[PDB]
């Protein structure tokens, strides 16, 4: 499925992910797309931070969902 | 009507409110339900942050609406 991740600066990145893919898979996709390390990225879905062990289906992430990416130092 | 509030931990809180009820009443209900003070709570729904001087009908909040709660430190 196609998903969109928005950062705090307004930049939106489109990725191809599956519902069974974990949040770590989304972090790896974002690292491939932009170069941000997975440990420096925080993913939020529906106002709640997504866990790396949990998947997109566990977080009820559907097609064309809007995830939130937060940078960390 | 019944409304849903999503927290950062994934817990969903169901609240009984009316369209004429202000966001201050919703903050008081959230304080009665979870103990979070109204000064440290921010409500986000339909692309706009909830204002204390506005009502649910002004924000076009209908039955079974899903808003998000953000806790300030």
């Amino acid at each position: 499925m196609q998903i969109f991740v928005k950062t705090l600066t307004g930049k939106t990145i489109t990725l191809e992910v599956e519902p069974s893919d974990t949040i770590e898979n989304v972090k790896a996709k974002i690292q491939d797309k932009e170069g941000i390390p997975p440990d420096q990225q925080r993913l939020i879905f529906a106002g709640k931070q997504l866990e790396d062990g949990r998947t997109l289906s566990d977080y009820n992430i559907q097609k064309e969902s809007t995830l939130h990416l937060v940078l960390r130092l | 009507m019944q409304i849903f509030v999503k927290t950062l931990t994934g817990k969903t809180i169901t609240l009984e409110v009316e369209p004429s009820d202000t966001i201050e009443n919703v903050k008081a209900k959230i304080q009665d339900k979870e103990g979070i003070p109204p000064d440290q709570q921010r409500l986000i729904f339909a692309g706009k942050q909830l204002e204390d001087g506005r009502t649910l009908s002004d924000y076009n909040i209908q039955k079974e609406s899903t808003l998000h709660l953000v806790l300030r430190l």
Binding site: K6, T7, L8, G10, I44, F45, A46, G47, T66, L67, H68, L69, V70, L71, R72, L73 | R42, I44, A46, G47, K48, Q49, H68, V70, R72, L73
Partner: peptide
């Protein structure tokens, strides 16, 4: 929206980072 919440959570995240920098500048000097 989720973008609004992202910007807000980044706002308190940067505020926590700046308080950490305050503590740093406290005891390095």
């Amino acid at each position: 929206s989720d973008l609004m919440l992202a910007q807000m959570l980044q706002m308190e995240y940067d505020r926590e980072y700046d308080a950490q920098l305050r503590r740093e500048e406290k005891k390095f000097n």
